[PDB]
């Protein structure tokens, strides 16, 4: 079954954020070993580096000091059992 706790596939779910402050993409998964990818639309992949961007299967993605490059439609993807899932969020500054 579904790897993501809350799944927003049609309408992204809003996420108010603040430039310079932390931002959290709520795509938490049902298990610690589920591999999740973070994509920015149009075309970009956010790479957790352990610092500015951090993964936490229980929270989601944690971006410290959210820049302009993160205001937008962000999508989390996880493939469980040959199946691809994705939840979308739309960050709205201010």
């Amino acid at each position: 079954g579904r790897p993501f706790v809350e799944m927003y596939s049609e309408i992204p779910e809003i996420i108010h954020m603040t430039e310079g402050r932390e931002l959290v993409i709520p795509c938490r998964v049902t298990s610690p070993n589920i591999t999740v990818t973070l994509k920015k639309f149009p075309l970009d992949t956010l790479i957790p580096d352990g610092k500015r961007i951090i993964w936490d299967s229980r929270k989601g993605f944690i971006i410290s000091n959210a820049t302009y490059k993160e205001i937008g439609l962000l999508t989390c993807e996880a493939t469980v059992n040959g199946h691809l899932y994705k939840t979308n969020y739309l960050t709205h500054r201010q």
Partner: protein, 95 residues
């Protein structure tokens, strides 16, 4: 049929879109000429950033040269080759 939010959003988002640009704006120097056509089709950044602080701007450019006809008042008209600016990549940035 209603257009789903996702489509509307991706389709409207800041990207290079074919724009029909008036030749006079590009060359506001040759006002002694009358062009044909008066406007041309150019790839230009367009669309929204969806954040008043951001603006959609070009992050990669290139030129294109086209055959434009210039008519000189009363004294003939020739086919001149004009170079125009095109936007290859657009990006939402802080104004």
């Amino acid at each position: 049929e209603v257009v789903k939010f996702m489509d509307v959003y991706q389709r409207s988002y800041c990207h290079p879109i074919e724009t029909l640009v008036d030749i006079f704006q590009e060359y506001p120097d040759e006002i002694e000429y009358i062009f044909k056509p008066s406007c041309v089709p150019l790839m230009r950044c367009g669309g929204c950033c969806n954040d008043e602080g951001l603006e959609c701007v070009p992050t990669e450019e290139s030129n294109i040269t086209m055959q434009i006809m210039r008519i000189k008042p009363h004294q003939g008209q020739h086919i001149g080759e004009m170079s125009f600016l095109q936007h290859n990549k657009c990006e939402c940035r802080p104004k």
